[PDB]
């Protein structure tokens, strides 16, 4: 049980009488009053201690990545990696380390929708036996900016306009595209956010990245540059925008519920931890600077090497105490890992320690159960708001004769202390500049775009078309096109169409046709369809429900999560048409007999909004899902102009429908249903 | 200009060089580094001061009503009301007082959707010349619970489950309905939240209520019991649930955008302030106890008396400094007004002062520009975090010979001080009980349901069906039915159908057929269509766009906000099909020629999602909006099976369509398009 250490702070209230926070049994359903219809008394200590606690429940949300959810798990090392790192959690084959992971969007406040288009956070804590090590990563391998000092500019520009606080959880507004075009470094991450990575099917269907080049350091001080990757065992999968939008309203909790359900159902998600490892002398060898976080390292130059696997298999018991309070920091580093001179990383180190002071309102946040390491804390820190321990050492300073030298200094040679990479040097003048090696903002955006499938490329174009069309300022829109043109004239032209502008002439400076692997989502089928969701459209009239129940049982055999939908909650029915929507499902299947709710009297029940069943089937099809109908239910497909010969559309007997749907769910999205320019 | 007083703290950065927060011009686009590809230096004071400010930007959201938006405006008294109150802001005809109003939902966090189903906040500050007076109201006249001590219970049950923090901004889950059924006083507000009040078309189309009985007190100490009402001059209007859901996704900012736009466009919204006035000796004379916040006073017993009007005409300059930071309190009271022994109001007084300490992390939040009164602060308060003043009086205590008696005591007869209603008395034993007069939890929910139109009643039932069907626990659903049945056997029967439960046996103790005016939304057409939105569906091909532009100009004459939609942003086009949705508009009109995008090739384009023009027209129709088509565009209506002669459907020449659409917009929703229980029987 990854959560074991937390059991000692769990509080069970079952079978108990109500109390105040300072003990003593009470009742707290009536205010104390002066007379039957009298005023409430100030001496009502019960009322006040209860309302004061309530009044003060809220803490500031994260300044970024406010919207998110997490779970506990276990990371298992596949080997003794002492040849590349001194890091203890990687020191032995099969060595296990508890983890907690939080996934998130970036721009939106708490309560914003999971399926907004955004970069996503993928933050992992390893509670190692040598301290907490966090990889605070995203689901996209590059970031918008090259120097941490520019972070408030980026974030201000993306978050809501400061006059009216519009729009929520969206880059689709003037200030964001003003920034993207004024600060061209941003174009690469922008392309990723405009691809499927911006609207993932779930947290479980994302890869993860540390983004920055870090260093692995061995006991003897030897170093390697490293990129951290998390490779999803569930496969990458993305929504389509028009679906993400409806889902944002129909279930803002889509991703957090998905993770929760997967874990509760015993379908814990896994990711392999992989690294790219390159020598120090490669820092500038690949046509860009590895200190530049707006670039990724093509796998063709340095393949992924798998180090282990983490599985998330325990949900939190209290979301606030665990998920909300957890405080990640890239400065949570351990022996065997070191930083690089990445100027984005450099400033994060400051920011994440400082921000906790805001969010936790005091300096002792590492003492919160979710933040505590498992490995022991021994130092001369004292006091501070909410000090939860009682220190025994009264000689809280070093050096000292009186404490006999304890706690003692640890370094590279004694006590397994942290140490900076011995070979690192500094040379040159102090400066407020960036290396000219950071200057190319367009080659990699082109590389990424090149590496997507034709429809996948169209999604990127259509996302930009959608977003930029919201920009009211004409010149910003032209500025955007000028910058896009530097990446691809074709991209610029196709976007320009939507904006009713003329794209600039070709500017071939950065154009090229190279491609790289591992960045596409839609070029590969899913490795498993376990946990995927099938909505079975039925009806309470006739024999449909019994067949739907039979269909459900067979589908659940293949690890699928099945929802039988009908007009009302009859025996066997999981959800009403009123409550159902296609966004909730990876596949939509009309049970035989249910055609009766697609036309005629059966389709006009006051029990659901007009057209509801047809809409679900229509949405499912247009959004590229496998859709099917059993037996006579094929009339339902006919009612919406859909034909059986189409890819990802299935009809016939129950056996045949199940087989096709299950194969279709591996394809996941049927891209033949989306038009491409030309 | 209601914001005039705020000008002194406004900061203009145009034409200036960048500085630190302690002055000194700087650059702050590059971190200071030890060498060309070097590590960042700790001595980079510029970096740290910039990022420290960024790092500490957020403050806690409000514990309830975290999601909302506000505006500045002016309140004008219609007369000298000194005959009923000593309140200075009501003391002369035409007297003007600056106001700020924040509207909100309740359950959802910041960032949740404006069109979630929920009670809505309607909080108004009057910056009077005798201190700040806040009416902290909602858009529904009754509250869930009868004693403030139960607030954390209600709120906890309605907010997301504490294990996984699901669901956001919704009562549609087990714990909420467990609470509603375990604590039946909640049933009244529940019915209102399940009506159109739960899903208003905008903040501008809501009424407002103080909910509690308060007291108006004259100079001589005579009091009357009072209910505060805000009556929208824009008329009440609501969405349908299936619409509100899509809108939550398509535009989470729908309501804050609507208010912002109305104000920017010079279409400031207004509400009349009205009161019901009750004799003290009639507190329990109307079939319930006026100290009970779960009850409203039927207007048949005590009609609304209009005292004045408030108009919101200025948007904020900085949302955070103004809207987010403003701190309302029902304890913000002034001479001429007093509290009552309403046990819910009673505890609010404590909670709103205390909670500011959490949100603002300090005791000086009244010093923030948006919280400051216009009338002057003089007392012996000192220090505290963030103290923004420098006090001159060194004898900061009373009584005192050394300060000559200043600041001096003010009371009823001296210095126009606040005073508690002199006639108020306490009688009886100290108790942790509620008056038996509070016992009836079903009569008024029944009264409210009786007072809605048939389709309006259907909306309530369908909302309950939708919500309750989310409850996983079977006993909880049965508990809910047992409670609904105490209100109305037919309601429980109709809801039971959805849940697959047996229609309960009548339990007539509280049943009655009484009706009251002023609670329906749909039984009345809008007084104005100004600001309402028309989506004109057009095309870049052919002559459609030119005709669309003409249609637009005429519509705009009648005060409408018109969006011309096409495949891409050609000249005259306001929005692409890709970016458009029916939820954005109050009416949808297909411009002549646009029928080409409803079928065949024109409907197949990489520029928008398959079926988008059709989906917009379909949604508009199904959600009860006025829909229309000019000339040949009638083919678009045909394509979605809509007959040209239905109510709320307009087809013909440009002139006729404009006429019909403008007429339909006053009706606003065409309720004939919604099935009522029994309709589908053979
Ligand atoms: C490679 C670039 C970056 C990545 C991958 C990244 C990732 C993340 C993630 C995943 C979180 C959410 C952690 C959680 O779930 O609690 C987060 C939060 C945060 N980030 Fe970053 N971020 C990056 C750049 C930056 C920069 C440049 C800054 C400032 C210099 C910054 C400052 C912050 C702050 C202040 C928080 C809030 C932390 C808290 O409140 O606990 N980030 N970031
Ligand atoms: C008639 C019943 C009630 C009404 C009409 C009401 C209305 C409101 C409104 C409109 C707001 C948001 C104000 C804004 O826009 O900033 C609010 C916030 C709040 N309410 Fe109430 N409420 C009621 C009951 C209660 C009760 C019984 C309590 C606790 C005893 C309570 C505690 C709070 C708190 C702590 C806030 C946050 C205030 C802040 O953070 O500034 N409310 N309420």
Curated annotation (Swiss-Prot), chain A:
Catalytic activity: 2 H2O2 = O2 + 2 H2O
Cofactor annotation: heme
GO annotations of cellular component type: cytosol
List of residues binding heme: 352
Active site: residue positions: 65, 138
Any one Gene Ontology molecular-function term assigned to this protein's record: catalase activity
Domain of life: Eukaryota
Gene3D superfamilies: 1.20.1370.20, 3.40.50.880, Catalase core domain
Induction: Induced under stress conditions, such as H(2)O(2), paraquat, cadmium, heat shock, uric acid and nitrate treatment.
One GO BP annotation of this record: hydrogen peroxide catabolic process
Alphabetical UniProt keywords: Heme, Hydrogen peroxide, Iron, Metal-binding, Oxidoreductase, Peroxidase, Signal
Transmembrane stretches, start-end: none
Family: Belongs to the catalase family.
Physiological role: Occurs in almost all aerobically respiring organisms and serves to protect cells from the toxic effects of hydrogen peroxide.
Protein name, entry field: Catalase-3
Species of the source: Neurospora crassa (strain ATCC 24698 / 74-OR23-1A / CBS 708.71 / DSM 1257 / FGSC 987)
């Amino acid at each position: 049980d990854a959560r074991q250490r937390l059991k000692e702070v769990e509080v069970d209230d079952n079978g108990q009488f109500m109390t105040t926070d300072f003990g003593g049994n009470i009742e707290e359903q009536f205010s104390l009053k002066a007379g039957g219809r009298g005023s409430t008394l100030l001496e009502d200590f019960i009322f006040r201690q209860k309302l004061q606690h309530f009044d003060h429940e809220r803490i500031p949300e994260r300044v970024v990545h406010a919207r998110g959810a997490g779970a506990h798990g276990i990371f298992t090392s596949y080997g003794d990696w002492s040849n590349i790192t001194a890091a203890s959690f990687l020191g032995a084959k099969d060595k296990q380390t508890p983890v907690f992971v939080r996934f998130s969007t970036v721009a939106g406040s708490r309560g914003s929708a999971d399926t907004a288009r955004d970069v996503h956070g993928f933050a992992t804590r390893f509670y190692t036996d040598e301290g907490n090590f966090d990889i605070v990563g995203n689901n996209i391998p590059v970031f918008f900016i090259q120097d941490a000092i520019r972070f408030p500019d980026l974030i201000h520009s993306v978050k809501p306009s400061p006059d009216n606080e519009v729009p929520q959880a969206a880059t689709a507004h003037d200030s964001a595209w003003d920034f993207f075009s004024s600060q061209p470094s941003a174009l690469h991450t922008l392309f990723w956010a405009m691809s499927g990575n911006g609207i993932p099917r779930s947290y479980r269907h994302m890869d993860g990245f540390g983004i920055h080049t870090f260093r692995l350091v061995t006991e003897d001080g030897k170093s390697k540059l490293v990129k951290w990757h998390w490779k999803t065992k569930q496969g990458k999968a993305a929504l389509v925008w028009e679906e993400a939008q409806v889902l944002a309203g129909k279930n803002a909790d889509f991703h957090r519920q998905d993770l929760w359900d997967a874990i509760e159902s015993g379908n814990a998600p896994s990711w392999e931890l992989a690294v790219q490892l390159i020598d120090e002398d490669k820092a500038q060898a690949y046509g860009f600077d590895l200190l530049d976080p707006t670039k990724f390292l093509p796998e063709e130059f340095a393949p992924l090497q798998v180090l282990g696997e983490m599985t998330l298999n325990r949900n939190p018991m209290n979301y606030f105490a665990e998920t909300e309070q957890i405080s990640f920091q890239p400065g949570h580093i351990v022996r065997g890992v070191d930083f690089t001179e990445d100027p984005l990383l450099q400033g994060r180190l400051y920011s994440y320690l400082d921000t906790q002071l805001n969010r936790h309102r005091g300096p002792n946040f590492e003492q919160l159960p979710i933040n505590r390491p498992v490995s022991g804390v021994h130092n001369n820190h004292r006091d501070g708001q909410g000090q939860a321990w009682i220190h025994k050492n009264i000689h809280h300073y070093s050096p000292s004769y009186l404490n006999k030298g304890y706690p003692a200094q640890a370094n590279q040679t004694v006590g397994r202390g942290f140490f900076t990479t011995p070979g690192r040097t500094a040379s040159g003048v102090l400066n407020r500049e960036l290396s000219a090696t950071f200057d190319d903002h367009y080659t990699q955006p082109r590389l990424f775009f090149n590496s997507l499938t034709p429809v996948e490329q169209q999604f990127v174009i259509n996302a930009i078309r959608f977003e930029a069309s919201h920009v009211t300022n004409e010149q910003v829109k032209k500025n955007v096109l000028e910058q896009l043109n530097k990446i691809s004239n074709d991209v610029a032209k196709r976007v320009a169409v939507a904006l009713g502008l003329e794209a600039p002439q070709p500017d071939p400076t950065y154009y090229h046709n190279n491609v790289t692997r591992g960045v596409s989502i839609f070029n590969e089928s899913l490795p498993t369809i376990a946990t995927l969701r099938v909505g079975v459209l039925s009806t309470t009239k006739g024999g449909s429900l019994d067949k739907a129940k039979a269909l459900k049982e067979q589908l659940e055999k293949d690890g699928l999560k099945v929802t039988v939908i009908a007009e009302y909650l009859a025996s066997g029915v999981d959800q009403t048409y009123s409550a159902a929507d296609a966004t909730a499902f990876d596949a939509v299947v009309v049970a035989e007999g249910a055609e009766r709710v697609f036309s005629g009297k059966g389709a006009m029940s006051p029990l659901f909004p007009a057209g509801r069943p047809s809409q679900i089937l229509t949405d499912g099809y247009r959004w590229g899902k496998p859709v099917a109908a059993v037996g006579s239910a094929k009339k339902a497909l006919q009612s919406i102009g859909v034909e059986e010969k189409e890819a990802g559309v299935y009809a016939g007997a129950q056996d045949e429908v199940i087989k096709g749907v299950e194969e279709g769910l591996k394809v996941f999205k049927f891209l033949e249903r989306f038009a491409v320019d030309g």
